[PDB]
């Protein structure tokens, strides 16, 4: 029988937790409401409700463009991370050039295959995914599997489906997911688990739960699966503090809170409020009951022949010399249109659709760094952490000696004469010389 | 580029010379049976050079041979070739030259199609799908475009995000900014026509009836009837989202998008001049053969392009009832987007799209104008006949109508839009104007439908009353002269001031949530305004009203389940509050209330690390001029309470889990802790009552610290600066990773330390700076601090401040490079000390804080630091822009560095190194040729650079001295 956090069961604690996130909850759902509502769905009338598509499309717009630029200030295709030598050690290791050089090169291939990690397993894709839901709900988790076959991404949960415990500090105590999966579909061993009791149809979908807690007597998490109350038997394992293969992040940190907060919370008024104009302004034009025009040239093409009275009859002109005001006429038209540009500019300002010293260094600099920073603290150094311990424990890179070999990020910016030769320059030409005429 | 010198050329852009690269080429070729497939690693800069520039002949064919021999053999051993997307890459060799290997090409597509090779980590995989994504593969698109077309049609459909729906592969977010380049089809269509055109066809109608069937598009999607001949109807899948695709304006597919741009541009480019009777038979084709109207709307786009060549497609549009629905839809959105809008080949081409001529009009406008207008190839024959066309359309909708007891108001609308265009029931009226004659077409309208309309209307202008108030409020808060157009609210107060009454009776007589939500927030920044811009005209009782309501908004982030939101009108009011305490003496304990309990506020707004404590602050700073006594009580105060303003939170929590929001936790505070707040409020708080700072937060001590004026003289601020100082480098300084400060917070001091001390007397710097002088490191803060330093000089001009703040922490330097750069983090305080790290202009002649003395800082530098690289690197970087001024002794200090150490020659640089000194050589050249010619000592140090630049392999430094010489 288990001990301390586990004592009750995966699902006591999923149930006794599940409490205190419906308010994040609703916050998210009313941020991917007025943005692209399939990010975090929740309406139960599917039989009468879209995932509702609004008149704005700029809150879809910002957001993407947002995560687009977080993702170039982390994880860029250049050197983002250092293997770090304890100066200490360093002052042993210079005995010999050789060794010196064998083993910065024997860092160099760590470092190659870390990178070579990242893109040969694609994870940039959900590193972008997980960027989207920071911004939509300002949480999520991560967890990255044990290498199996050729090709091992990451798997991401929202948080619909998790729970997570933190003290005054921080510290996460315990982590719970909620997993379903139908019946049929399970692995042998585990379809065998289940003869006793309610009879399974083929489709039923099986509530799993997933248990992870901190130990006293060991510096470790502990892990078990959980279905009906009874453990899955050989699902059971141990991670050190250090490197435990779950990876919970939050957009913006608070102290005595499990979870973190959404960006655009602060702006879902003006959301609410630019939409409410632009259906106003579509009705405008549906309802009006006359149409006016102007003819350009001065009139030299003699319209009297309409005010004679022929329908029969024609002037002599063209759609190159012909107007109409079929929107601009109605007389709030002007008043929520200008509205509508206040509003459009706080936005697009804020989703970042934009003396010597360069002012870019506050709002492409020092407005990102922190973020940048933050999740180089909660999202990339665990992450590497990680890799750096699964590549050892598949023997994939040596076991270097752990007082001198140490990862850190290198936030900033790269070098610039490889940038214009390519962007600039040869990429520009690439194009030119494609799209000339045949 | 006109001039045709490589010392004034704006770029050097090279190309290959003589016979050497075709004999070394095909002498690599013939023997690679002897060399072996694993050796010749050594060729693949001289075939990628050569495929760069020259794309036919012979050299070209062995060139790309060889790469793609290289290519297999890392495929059969399974050795890793890093995909990083690089011009220089061996993929692109292979690509370049396309043209000349095309039976090979053609093997390596079959083997693809026939083994299904379409996962990752499978034969060929980063080469297909470049031939699918990259611009450098239109010779394959040219070449064998059969094969291209299939290929698509393997990579792009998964058989059964809103791409799930579609049945699409996540690999789709490559084509995201979506544009009618993002693929091979705008060329495909120019290759072979027919067979890309039935390719279109056939991937729409299997994605849109993937997302119909979805859960995604159950109650958004509709079917419709579409008329095609006599008794001959099809059906089709319609939504708002699926018509506007080829426009971007909805939140659909980047590809499918990408697809119907391509398409709509390829017929508005090369049909510009066509027979009608070949324009009409192919629009006809596409609306007989699809399954998805965003088909038809791309259709519909080419006869409102081309109007007077398509009538007998328009004929067609007209008798579908729906499509002009949807078009008005589309009208709508397009008159808005381009505001929204306002990778740069394709956004280039999404602005000049939304100046497209055609995107003004819309069906309705069409219907019309063929009624009336008559261009020059058309008799007037011809122009009866299309009336009688178009009226037996008409008669044929107006039988169709219903009884009128059962109409909806979709049924209004569209006798509305059969209004619009029936031109047997319109009267004509016409003006003279300064642009032309404006013409008013009138319709004889039916009595039940005029009153429909006219209460819409009505109802409307209810709606947007006070939106012009709302405008004038918000321009004049934004001080955008905007404003001056208004001259119904500008010298107009009072008037202002009833409609705000009326406002405030309306939020109160249980105001809903559609009017609140518009209107919730005008008497605000109504009342501001006026206190802080017309107060002298105001009388007492407009002046007592707008005090009242200023106060009950400040009042409002003080009650439990307050949220911030960036109008919600508090900021406004709490910005008047200066007015208020100078005017009313009465008001002043509930002022110093309301900022004292609004200072204890931590929440953090936006993403650049600020809180909500900022707006207090504000006002604080503009009372200290008249109020010292009181202000500095504030200060003293927030000192004193908020330490225990945290326990009591933390109690209060605690007890509502032992039987948080039922509880006012101000109420609270304010009866526990009267006899302190007393002393607040009668100013009786010295920094004698204050503790010892060893143990408060540095969260708190920063609070206090953007209090203080950066100017000021006082004896208790000076003394109190002195020990939040101390303070924080202890911290900042060390190498335990449990005393690490955060980096928002890092930020917030270092500036605001920096203005403290470039404000002070000369002979008072030495003591600022001096916790940082002795406890000096290779810390990364010591980076930060040089960073902010250069910044506020940047904006104050200090000169011999800044100067003697910079000769102070030389020998410091000095002393850290003598152990290596690697260390720690020495090389950025390298780097910041020397001004290399800082986002300077592009242009720049020199720097206001530069002057021909200082010339000797550089003269130590270089005497002093020249073995670490990051010496060098610093001095080239800045004698290329902001330290240009100095560029003839530029010369010889670098010139110096290289001649004493050796060792250079042999480590290893940081980037760009040698792409600088390459412009600094060449730049000084073109300006000095006479003097270096004719003076031996210029040319000696000039070649030192030279030679350098020849060892590591610089062809700009190889001909820079087939000149000189």
Redesign the interface.
């Known amino acids: 029988k288990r001990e301390g956090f586990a004592e009750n069961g995966a699902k006591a604690v999923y149930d006794a937790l599940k409490n205190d996130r419906n308010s994040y909850e609703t916050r998210a759902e009313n941020c991917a409401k007025y943005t ?1 509502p ?2 975090f769905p929740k309406d139960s009338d ?1 039989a ?4 509702t ?1 609004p ?1 704005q ?2 809150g ?2 910002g957001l ?1 463009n947002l995560a ?1 630029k977080l993702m170039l200030a982390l994880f860029p ?1 250049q050197t983002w991370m250092k293997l770090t030598i304890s ?1 200490f050690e ?1 002052k042993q290791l210079v005995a010999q050039p050789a060794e010196l050089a064998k083993v910065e090169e024997g860092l160099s291939m760590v470092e ?1 295959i870390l ?2 990690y990242i ?2 397993n ?1 994870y940039r ?1 959900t590193l ?1 995914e997980t960027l989207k839901q920071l911004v939509v709900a300002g949480n999520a988790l991560l967890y990255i599997p044990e290498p199996e076959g ?2 091992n991404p990451m798997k991401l949960y929202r948080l619909s489906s998790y729970v997570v415990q933190r003290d005054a500090f921080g510290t996460v105590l315990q982590i719970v997911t909620l997993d379903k999966t139908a019946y049929a579909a399970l692995p042998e061993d585990v379809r065998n688990a289940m003869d006793s009791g309610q009879e399974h149809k083929g489709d039923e979908m099986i509530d799993v739960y997933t248990h992870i807690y901190l130990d006293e007597e060991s510096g470790e998490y502990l892990k078990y699966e959980e279905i009906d109350g009874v453990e899955v038997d050989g699902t059971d394992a141990s991670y050190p503090v250090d490197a435990c293969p779950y990876i919970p992040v939050r957009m ?1 940190r608070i102290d ?1 809170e499990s979870y973190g907060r959404s ?1 655009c ?6 959301l ?2 630019l939409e ?1 104009l ?1 259906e ?20 030299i093409t003699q ?2 022949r ?2 004679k009275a022929q ?2 009859d ?6 190159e010399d ?3 005001l ?2 601009e006429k109605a ?2 038209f002007s ?8 509003i ?1 500019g ?1 936005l ?1 300002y804020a989703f970042m659709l934009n ?4 002012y ?3 709002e492409l ?7 940048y ?2 999740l180089s603290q909660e999202l990339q150094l665990p992450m590497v952490r990680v890799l750096l311990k699964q590549l050892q424990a598949t023997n994939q890179i040596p076991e270097l000696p752990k007082e001198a070999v140490e990862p850190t990020i290198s936030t900033g910016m790269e ?4 940038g214009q030769d ?1 962007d600039k ?3 520009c030409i ?2 030119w010389s ?2 000339a005429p ?1 | 580029v006109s001039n045709s010198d490589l010392l004034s050329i704006k770029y050097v852009l090279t190309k290959p010379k003589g016979t050497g690269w075709q004999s070394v080429i095909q002498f690599i070729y013939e023997n690679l049976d002897e060399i072996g497939i694993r050796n010749i690693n050594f060729i693949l800069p001289v075939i990628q050079e050569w495929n760069q520039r020259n794309k036919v002949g012979e050299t070209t064919r062995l060139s790309s041979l060889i790469a793609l021999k290289y290519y297999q053999w890392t495929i059969d051993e399974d050795v890793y070739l890093s995909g990083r997307d690089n011009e220089k890459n061996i993929l692109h060799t292979i690509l370049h030259g396309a043209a000349m290997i095309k039976p090979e090409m053609e093997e390596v597509l079959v083997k693809v199609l026939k083994n299904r090779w379409k996962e990752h980590g499978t034969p060929y995989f980063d080469l297909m799908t470049l031939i699918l994504t990259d611009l450098d593969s239109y010779p394959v698109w040219a070449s064998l475009p059969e094969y291209v077309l299939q290929l698509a049609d393997l990579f792009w459909y998964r058989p059964l995000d809103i791409e799930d729906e579609f049945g699409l592969f996540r690999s789709h977010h490559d084509y995201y900014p979506e544009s009618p380049y993002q693929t091979p089809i705008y060329w495909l269509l120019q290759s072979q026509f027919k067979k890309t055109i039935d390719f279109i066809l056939d991937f729409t109608n299997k994605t849109t009836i993937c997302f119909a069937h979805s859960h995604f598009a159950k109650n958004e999607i509709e079917e419709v009837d579409v008329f095609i001949e006599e008794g001959k109807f099809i059906k089709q899948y319609i939504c708002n989202r699926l018509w506007c695709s080829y426009r971007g304006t909805q939140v659909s597919t980047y590809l499918l998008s990408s697809i119907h741009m391509a398409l709509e541009k390829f017929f508005l480019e090369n049909f510009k001049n066509a027979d009608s009777k070949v324009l009409e038979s192919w629009l006809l084709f596409l609306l007989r053969n699809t399954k998805s109207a965003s088909i038809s709307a791309v259709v519909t786009s080419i006869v409102l392009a081309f109007p007077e060549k398509t009538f007998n497609v328009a004929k067609v549009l007209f008798q579908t009832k729906d499509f002009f629905r949807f078009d008005m839809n589309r009208m709508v959105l397009d008159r808005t987007h381009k505001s929204s809008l306002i990778n740069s080949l394709h956004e280039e081409d999404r602005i000049k799209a939304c100046d497209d001529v055609h995107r003004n009009t819309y069906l309705e406008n069409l219907a019309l104008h063929y009624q009336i207008f008559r261009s020059e190839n058309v008799t007037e024959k011809d122009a009866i006949e299309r009336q009688q066309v178009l009226w037996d359309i008409f008669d044929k909708y107006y039988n169709q109508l219903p009884d009128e007891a059962q109409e909806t108001e979709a049924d209004k609308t569209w006798r509305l839009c059969l209004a619009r265009m029936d031109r047997r029931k319109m009267k004509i009226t016409t003006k003279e104007k300064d642009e032309g004659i404006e013409i008013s077409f009138n319709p004889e309208i039916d009595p039940k439908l005029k009153q429909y309309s006219e209460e819409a209307i009505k109802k409307n202008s209810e709606h947007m009353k006070y939106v012009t108030l709302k405008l004038w409020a918000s321009y004049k808060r934004e001080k955008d002269e905007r404003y001056k157009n208004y001259g119904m609210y500008e010298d107009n107060p009072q008037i202002a001031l009833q409609e705000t009454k009326e406002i405030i009776k309306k939020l109160n007589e249980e105001g809903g949530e559609d009017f609140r939500l518009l209107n919730g927030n005008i008497p605000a920044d109504v009342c501001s305004v006026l206190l802080l811009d017309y107060f002298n005209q105001l009388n007492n009782e407009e002046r007592e009203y707008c005090k009242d309501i200023v106060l009950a908004y400040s009042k409002l982030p003080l009650k439990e389940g307050y949220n911030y939101q960036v109008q919600d009108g508090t900021t406004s009011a709490i910005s008047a509050l200066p007015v208020i305490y100078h005017n009313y003496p009465m008001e002043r304990e509930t002022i110093k209330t309301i900022l004292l309990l609004t200072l204890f506020n931590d929440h953090s707004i936006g993403m650049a690390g600020g809180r909500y404590s900022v707006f207090p602050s504000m006002v604080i700073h503009k009372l200290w001029l008249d109020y010292f006594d009181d202000m500095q009580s504030l200060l003293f105060g927030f000192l004193i309470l908020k330490p225990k303003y945290v326990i009591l939170s933390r109690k209060i929590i605690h007890e509502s889990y032992r039987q948080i929001k039922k509880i006012n936790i101000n109420k609270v505070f304010l009866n526990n802790y009267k006899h302190c707040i007393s002393n607040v409020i009668d100013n009786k708080i010295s920094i004698d009552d204050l503790g010892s700072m060893d143990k408060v937060d540095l969260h708190i001590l920063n609070t206090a610290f953007q209090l203080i004026p950066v100017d000021t003289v006082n004896i208790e601020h000076k003394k109190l600066v002195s020990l939040i100082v101390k303070r924080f480098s202890t911290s900042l300084l060390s190498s335990v990773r449990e005393d690490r400060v955060d980096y928002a917070l890092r930020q917030s001091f270092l500036e605001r330390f920096a203005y403290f001390t470039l404000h002070a007397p000369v002979s008072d710097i030495p003591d600022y700076i001096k916790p940082f002088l002795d406890g000096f490191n290779g810390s990364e803060p010591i980076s930060e601090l040089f960073k902010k330093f250069i910044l506020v000089e940047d904006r104050l001009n200090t000169y011999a401040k800044f100067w003697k703040v910079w000769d102070l922490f030389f020998d410091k330097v000095v002393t850290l490079c003598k152990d290596g750069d690697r260390y720690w983090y020495v090389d950025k305080i390298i780097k910041s000390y020397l001004f290399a790290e800082s986002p300077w202009k592009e242009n720049s002649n020199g720097w206001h804080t530069f002057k021909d003395s200082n010339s000797q800082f550089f003269c130590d530098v270089s005497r002093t630091m020249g073995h670490c690289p990051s010496t060098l690197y610093s001095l080239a970087k800045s004698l290329n822009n902001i330290a240009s001024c100095y560029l003839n002794q530029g010369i010889t200090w670098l010139s110096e560095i290289l001649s004493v150490n050796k060792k250079l020659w042999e480590k290893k640089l940081e980037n760009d190194t040698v792409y600088y000194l390459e412009c600094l050589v060449r730049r000084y050249i073109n300006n000095e040729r006479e003097r270096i010619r004719r003076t031996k000592q210029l040319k000696q140090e000039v070649l030192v650079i030279l030679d350098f630049l020849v060892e590591k392999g610089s062809v700009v430094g190889y001909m820079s001295r087939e000149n000189i010489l």
């Not at chain 1, 919370?265 to 003006?270: I, K, N, T």
């Not at chain 1, 034009?285 to 025009?293: D, E, P, Q, R, W």
């Not at chain 1, 024609?314 to 759609?319: D, H, L, N, Y």
């Not at chain 1, 070098?415 to 490889?418: N, Q, T």
């Open positions: 692209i399939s990010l599917n009468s409700t879209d995932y598509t008149w499309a700029v879809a717009r993407n687009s295709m100066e360093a190659r990178m070579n893109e040969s694609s894709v972008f050729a090709y913006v005595g960006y919370e602060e702006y879902l008024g003006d609410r409020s409410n632009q106003a302004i579509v009705k405008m034009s549906m309802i009006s009951a006359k149409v006016i025009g102007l003819v350009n040239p001065a009139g319209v009297r309409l005010t329908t029969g024609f002037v002599s002109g063209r759609p012909i107007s109409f079929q929107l007389a709030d008043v929520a249109k200008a509205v509508s540009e206040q459009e706080r697009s003396e010597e010293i360069r870019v260094a506050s600099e020092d407005t990102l760094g922190g973020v920073s933050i070098a610039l004469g490889r390519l320059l040869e990429r690439a194009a494609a799209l045949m």
